[PDB]
RNA sequence: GACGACCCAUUCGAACGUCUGCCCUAUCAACUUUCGAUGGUAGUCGCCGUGCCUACCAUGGUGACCACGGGUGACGGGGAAUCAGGGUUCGAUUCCGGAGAGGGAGCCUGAGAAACGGCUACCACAUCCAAGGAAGGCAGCAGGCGCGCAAAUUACCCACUCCCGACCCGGGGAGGUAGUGACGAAAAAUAACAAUACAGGACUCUUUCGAGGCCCUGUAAUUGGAAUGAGUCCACUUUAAAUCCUUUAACGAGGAUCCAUUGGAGGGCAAGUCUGGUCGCAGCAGCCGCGGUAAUUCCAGCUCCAAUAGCGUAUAUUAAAGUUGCUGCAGUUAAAAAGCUCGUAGUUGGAUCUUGGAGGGUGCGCCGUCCCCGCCUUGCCUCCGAAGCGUUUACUUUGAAAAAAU
């Protein structure tokens, strides 16, 4: 029955300059709320914690190395690092953008499956795109590397094949039982 | 030192004439009123050089 | 640097600091039980009374009005205290005899800005909140 | 929509006479399928027929089309309804059995207790 | 609490190395008095349904266990809680298959098949040697078993091939630098090694220097050493891994490598 | 193919014994024994150690290194919360150890109980009665009264998880299962895309006027095709049987919705150099301060901000607070060096006793770079091992021993 906290709000609460730099991240990340920003600044301070933590250590020391490589490889996957970095001392200079740029919803745009990270959203809300075999309706999701090229609409929605829409077949219908006869 | 009276007591709140609520609008839901917030404050929000402006002002 | 540096002088140094502790006045408030032992309210954090008397307090200068609390005896501890009624002809929906819900101002125990001597506000009555109350939200039950 | 019945992680399990094995069954597009169905559709995999494969567990996916659950098939009926769970025999018309429901019961025999051996005597008062 | 023997187990508060779930329930089996001390042990419950996965119920095991299916060191058990252990056999018949209880590298009782012979004999640690009565001696093993008569060679921490359906013992191993070892508790619980030295205290605590097939060396408390023969000269089964130890990067290395390819 | 016994060991334990670590308090400084306080010695007792008890016999044992006494929003710990680092605070409460079942005391049985879903007395409470009698203990599960700031069903099941018994089979308010459930935590709906239509800006062209143009955002005009569960619902799943989830045929989005909220907009502080109303009145205002007739603080709207299926308020406590200051405070004048010195505890204490090339870890493409080690007087003796064996420590170093949950 354990359980966790998720994010973690700013010591401060009105830094204008703080707001704004919010707002550009939820307008291009078709965010929802500050939480979904704060969500994500969140993440990246225990990312970064982990991260210094790490690099005070001696090199070659059987923590460093075998927790080091981990946070690294784990960094990869998802590509949210790359390799040079892909060391600890390049995971110390980096940012949000970089997990927040790994969500479905920003994806579903980048190849034209959406143009708008709007469209992305409700599309992915509403049970159009799976990953490979699974719906997936979480918009907040983390696409990893090989999983790229399995994102498609889904079998059955119907654009992915399927009748039209319970509000399209409902216009088919619009024109069958006046237009048609009595 | 009290003494006094309250005879007064809620004459402002019983004085003030009744506004009607009117109406209007809707607004939007979550992550999209966010996004017309991001437009209209910064795309909108282009912003003139004028030495600055406002949000809640009339002339 | 008032204050032995030798490797040993543990005991010297934990036990001076537990004696200036004191003069903190949260640190001894909280050691001697005050809250407990003066305090009209439990060390609680809220506590119900009857209402006793309306009183129309003189709030002090520079500011000028009448303040309008109630006295109201705590069911707890027989304790009798005055209660503060906010907002506009609030008082109105208190009467006397009445019961009520009385809570800190958020000063620490120490009374509110020209309200002289009252330190506690009322929040329920009708068991019914003043809020409520005085929006329309709900009504002097009955 | 034709489905497929695919039963993965195999056991041959002689000390319970039974074969049991998860059961895998893509639905492509609509949803879901019968437990006789199922059970059915096993029979004819496993040389076996319907009364001796059980089939119990099932969740259906997320999203639809697919939903994994667990089957076991006997070697004898007889077998099975010794090695069994008797509420499992019972869901499929071979087993049933008393209700109660349990505090009624439960009643009796604090009733009987109050009388002296005999207690017959406390079934009659029941 | 205060008048009487403990029945029940919160599970929880069971021996991390059966590897029972969280979640399930609140009470974990909690072993039977026998052969082997509670958290030495392995209910048998847990091996049927929780490492074979014969049983899936707690039902099921018992069901298992009345038809007389499964012996341990050859003399059908019927007991869900029976406390199986280190050295123990366990011979499910209708079925055919011998199992001897012996540890993992992580400290867990390893799902180990033995042949159809082998599982005739187990090795058991003598605990004491004893002028019992009548002036007869005894010696008796790490598994509670007391056999008279012993060959005065034997001393104790000396470890000694017990037949297994008669009793008797036939054989020996000294407790000598050299000697192949099998560690039985704490920290090195699994490696396998030579010796190289036993440091001595009196009062109390002897540790046992231990070398390995990789010149990896370790201590441990003697009470934690068990014979089990000759270097290079197992008198048993080894599991996989030859009780070796692999740092969590060789262990990484093996788990990339070994596979999304390699065959 | 269907339990006893003697004695020993074993297993689960038990009962005691070692140390080392605990809150506040000196407006608690001496304490403990003639009803043993500390010790001798012997016995009786106990499962057994032991002033347990008792005789005799000594006169002890403890304290400024806080004893003794008193207090307590003290059950103890694993743990929890607050994150520089140091720290700061909590811990009844899913585990461990301890304690109790109205208060007190006693006892039977049995291997195990000083048991209360045993008994027995008194003491406090309550109940039945034909008035002599008689029967009882929810700090078990539900529920109810009282109490209060505050806390759920008089529901289903032994199928799971396990336990017990003569037991595969029975029994389990252990425990699971549903109901209530914004402690609190996770996922995150209440609407996406073109088009006209327009409103617009970097780009280009032009002497200018003017025109083109990419990137698009709105904003209507309605369109236009493009959509999904929230509800509802054959069927099916779940499971002991159900529910819900996770599953879906048939339905379910043109806004007046299938209708999002709660605080704020004078300063700190994010946001009205508003409009009506009042005129230091009502109210606002943690603090500073507003309102005494053009109120950006009120009272309302309008409009806007902030957090958003949550948000306000009160309160304990923590962070902030280097305002308790080890790290890391101040004390000439701001709150603070005793009038001065002696002085025990405590703390604190000068210099000086041994010197003067390769082995192994991880980076970079057979080569090397960068640690670590015995080297270019270093345990004696007993006489390689063994043993003798340590001058005492603190320290620090390397091991083992180190509950799980966390």
Redesign the pocket.
């Not at chain 3, 002090?60 to 907002?87: D, E, M, Y």
């Given at each position: 029955?354990?359980?966790?906290?998720?994010?973690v709000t700013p010591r401060r609460?009105?830094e204008?300059s703080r707001?704004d730099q919010e707002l550009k991240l939820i307008g291009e990340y078709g965010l929802?709320?500050?939480?979904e920003v704060?969500?994500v600044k969140f993440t990246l301070?225990?990312i970064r914690?982990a991260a210094r933590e790490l690099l005070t250590l001696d090199?070659?020391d059987p923590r460093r190395?075998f927790e080091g490589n981990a946070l690294l490889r784990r960094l990869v996957r998802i590509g949210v690092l790359d390799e040079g970095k892909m060391k600890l001392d390049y995971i110390l200079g980096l940012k949000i953008e970089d997990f927040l740029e790994r969500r479905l919803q920003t994806q579903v745009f980048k190849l034209g499956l959406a143009?708008?990270i709007?469209?992305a959203?409700?599309?992915?809300?509403?049970?159009?795109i799976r990953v490979r075999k699974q719906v997936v309706n979480?918009?907040?999701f983390i696409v990893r590397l090989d999983s790229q090229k399995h994102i498609d609409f889904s079998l059955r929605?119907?654009?992915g094949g399927g009748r039209?829409?319970?509000?399209?077949?409902?216009?088919a219908?619009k024109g069958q039982g006046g237009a048609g006869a009595g | 030192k009290v003494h006094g009276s309250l005879a007064?007591?809620?004459?402002?709140?019983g004085?003030?004439?009744?506004?009607?609520?009117?109406?209007?609008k809707?607004k939007?839901?979550?992550?999209?009123?966010?996004?017309?917030?991001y437009?209209?404050?910064f795309?909108?929000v282009?912003p003139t050089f004028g030495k600055k402006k406002?949000?809640?002002?009339?002339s | 640097?008032?204050?032995?540096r030798?490797?040993?002088?543990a005991?010297?140094?934990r036990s001076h600091?537990?004696?200036?502790?004191?003069?903190?006045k949260?640190?001894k408030?909280?050691?001697l039980?005050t809250?407990?032992k003066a305090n009209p309210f439990?060390?609680?954090?809220?506590?119900?009374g009857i209402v006793l008397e309306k009183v129309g307090v003189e709030?002090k200068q520079?500011?000028?009005?009448?303040r309008?609390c109630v006295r109201v005896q705590?069911?707890?501890n027989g304790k009798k205290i005055t209660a503060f009624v906010?907002?506009?002809?609030?008082?109105n929906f208190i009467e006397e005899n009445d019961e009520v819900?009385v809570?800190?101002?958020?000063?620490?125990?120490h009374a509110?800005?020209?309200?002289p001597g009252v330190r506690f506000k009322v929040?329920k009555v009708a068991n019914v909140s003043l809020?409520a109350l005085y929006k329309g939200k709900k009504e002097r039950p009955r | 929509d034709t489905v497929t019945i695919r039963t993965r992680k195999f056991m041959t399990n002689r000390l319970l006479q039974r074969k049991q094995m998860v059961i895998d069954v893509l639905h492509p597009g609509?949803?879901?399928?019968?437990?006789?169905e199922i059970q059915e559709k096993l029979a004819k995999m496993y040389k076996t027929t319907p009364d001796v494969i059980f089939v119990?567990?099932?969740?259906?996916?997320?999203?639809?089309?697919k939903?994994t659950?667990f089957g076991m098939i006997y070697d004898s009926l007889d077998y099975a309804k010794k090695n069994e769970?008797?509420?499992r025999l019972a869901?499929h018309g071979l087993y049933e059995k008393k209700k109660?429901?349990?505090?009624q019961?439960?009643e009796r025999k604090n009733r009987m207790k109050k009388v002296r051996g005999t207690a017959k005597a406390n079934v009659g008062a029941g | 609490?205060?008048?009487?023997?403990?029945?029940?187990?919160?599970?929880?508060?069971?021996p991390?190395h059966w590897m029972?779930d969280?979640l399930?329930?609140?009470?974990?089996?909690?072993?039977s008095?026998?052969?082997?001390?509670?958290?030495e042990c392995l209910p048998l419950?847990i091996f049927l349904?929780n490492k074979l996965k014969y049983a899936?119920?707690?039902?099921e095991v018992?069901?298992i266990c009345?038809?007389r299916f499964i012996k341990i060191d050859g003399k059908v058990r019927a007991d869900?809680?029976y406390?199986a252990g280190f050295m123990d056999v366990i011979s499910i018949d209708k079925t055919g298959e011998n199992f001897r209880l012996i540890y993992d590298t992580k400290g867990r009782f390893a799902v180990h098949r033995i042949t159809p012979e082998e599982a005739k004999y187990k090795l058991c640690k003598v605990r004491?040697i004893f002028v019992?009565?009548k002036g007869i001696p005894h010696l008796?093993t790490h598994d509670?078993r007391?056999i008279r008569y012993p060959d005065p060679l034997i001393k104790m921490n000396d470890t000694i091939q017990i037949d297994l359906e008669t009793g008797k013992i036939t054989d020996f191993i000294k407790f000598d630098t050299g000697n192949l070892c099998m560690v039985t508790?704490?920290?090195?619980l699994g490696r396998i090694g030579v010796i190289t030295n036993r440091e001595?205290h009196p009062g109390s605590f002897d540790?046992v220097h231990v070398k390995d097939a990789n010149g990896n060396s370790?201590?441990?408390?003697l009470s934690?050493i068990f014979v089990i023969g000759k270097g290079n000269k197992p008198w048993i089964s080894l599991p996989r891994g030859k009780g070796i130890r692999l740092t969590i990067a060789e262990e990484r290395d093996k788990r990339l490598a070994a596979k999304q390819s390699s065959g």
């Amino acid at each position: 029955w354990v359980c966790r906290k998720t994010y973690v709000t700013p010591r401060r609460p009105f830094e204008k300059s703080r707001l704004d730099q919010e707002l550009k991240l939820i307008g291009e990340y078709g965010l929802r709320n500050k939480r979904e920003v704060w969500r994500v600044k969140f993440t990246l301070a225990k990312i970064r914690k982990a991260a210094r933590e790490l690099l005070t250590l001696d090199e070659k020391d059987p923590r460093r190395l075998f927790e080091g490589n981990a946070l690294l490889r784990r960094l990869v996957r998802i590509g949210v690092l790359d390799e040079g970095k892909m060391k600890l001392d390049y995971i110390l200079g980096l940012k949000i953008e970089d997990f927040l740029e790994r969500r479905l919803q920003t994806q579903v745009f980048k190849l034209g499956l959406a143009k708008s990270i709007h469209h992305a959203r409700v599309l992915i809300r509403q049970r159009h795109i799976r990953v490979r075999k699974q719906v997936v309706n979480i918009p907040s999701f983390i696409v990893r590397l090989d999983s790229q090229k399995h994102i498609d609409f889904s079998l059955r929605s119907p654009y992915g094949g399927g009748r039209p829409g319970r509000v399209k077949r409902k216009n088919a219908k619009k024109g069958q039982g006046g237009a048609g006869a009595g | 030192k009290v003494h006094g009276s309250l005879a007064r007591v809620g004459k402002v709140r019983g004085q003030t004439l009744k506004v009607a609520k009117q109406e209007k609008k809707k607004k939007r839901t979550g992550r999209a009123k966010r996004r017309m917030q991001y437009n209209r404050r910064f795309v909108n929000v282009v912003p003139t050089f004028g030495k600055k402006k406002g949000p809640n002002a009339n002339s | 640097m008032g204050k032995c540096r030798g490797l040993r002088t543990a005991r010297k140094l934990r036990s001076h600091r537990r004696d200036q502790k004191w003069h903190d006045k949260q640190y001894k408030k909280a050691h001697l039980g005050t809250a407990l032992k003066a305090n009209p309210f439990g060390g609680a954090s809220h506590a119900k009374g009857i209402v006793l008397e309306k009183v129309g307090v003189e709030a002090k200068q520079p500011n000028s009005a009448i303040r309008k609390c109630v006295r109201v005896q705590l069911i707890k501890n027989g304790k009798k205290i005055t209660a503060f009624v906010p907002n506009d002809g609030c008082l109105n929906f208190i009467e006397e005899n009445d019961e009520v819900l009385v809570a800190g101002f958020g000063r620490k125990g120490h009374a509110v800005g020209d309200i002289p001597g009252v330190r506690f506000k009322v929040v329920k009555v009708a068991n019914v909140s003043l809020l409520a109350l005085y929006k329309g939200k709900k009504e002097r039950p009955r | 929509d034709t489905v497929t019945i695919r039963t993965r992680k195999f056991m041959t399990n002689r000390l319970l006479q039974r074969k049991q094995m998860v059961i895998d069954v893509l639905h492509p597009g609509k949803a879901t399928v019968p437990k006789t169905e199922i059970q059915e559709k096993l029979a004819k995999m496993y040389k076996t027929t319907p009364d001796v494969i059980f089939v119990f567990g099932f969740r259906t996916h997320f999203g639809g089309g697919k939903t994994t659950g667990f089957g076991m098939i006997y070697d004898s009926l007889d077998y099975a309804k010794k090695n069994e769970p008797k509420h499992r025999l019972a869901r499929h018309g071979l087993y049933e059995k008393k209700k109660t429901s349990r505090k009624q019961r439960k009643e009796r025999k604090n009733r009987m207790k109050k009388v002296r051996g005999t207690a017959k005597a406390n079934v009659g008062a029941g | 609490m205060a008048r009487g023997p403990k029945k029940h187990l919160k599970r929880v508060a069971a021996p991390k190395h059966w590897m029972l779930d969280k979640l399930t329930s609140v009470f974990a089996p909690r072993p039977s008095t026998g052969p082997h001390k509670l958290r030495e042990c392995l209910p048998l419950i847990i091996f049927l349904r929780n490492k074979l996965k014969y049983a899936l119920t707690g039902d099921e095991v018992k069901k298992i266990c009345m038809q007389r299916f499964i012996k341990i060191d050859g003399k059908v058990r019927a007991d869900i809680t029976y406390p199986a252990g280190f050295m123990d056999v366990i011979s499910i018949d209708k079925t055919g298959e011998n199992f001897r209880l012996i540890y993992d590298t992580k400290g867990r009782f390893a799902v180990h098949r033995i042949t159809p012979e082998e599982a005739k004999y187990k090795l058991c640690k003598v605990r004491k040697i004893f002028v019992g009565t009548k002036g007869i001696p005894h010696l008796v093993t790490h598994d509670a078993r007391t056999i008279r008569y012993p060959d005065p060679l034997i001393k104790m921490n000396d470890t000694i091939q017990i037949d297994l359906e008669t009793g008797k013992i036939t054989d020996f191993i000294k407790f000598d630098t050299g000697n192949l070892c099998m560690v039985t508790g704490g920290a090195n619980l699994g490696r396998i090694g030579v010796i190289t030295n036993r440091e001595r205290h009196p009062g109390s605590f002897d540790v046992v220097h231990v070398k390995d097939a990789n010149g990896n060396s370790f201590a441990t408390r003697l009470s934690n050493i068990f014979v089990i023969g000759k270097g290079n000269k197992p008198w048993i089964s080894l599991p996989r891994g030859k009780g070796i130890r692999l740092t969590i990067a060789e262990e990484r290395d093996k788990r990339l490598a070994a596979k999304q390819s390699s065959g």
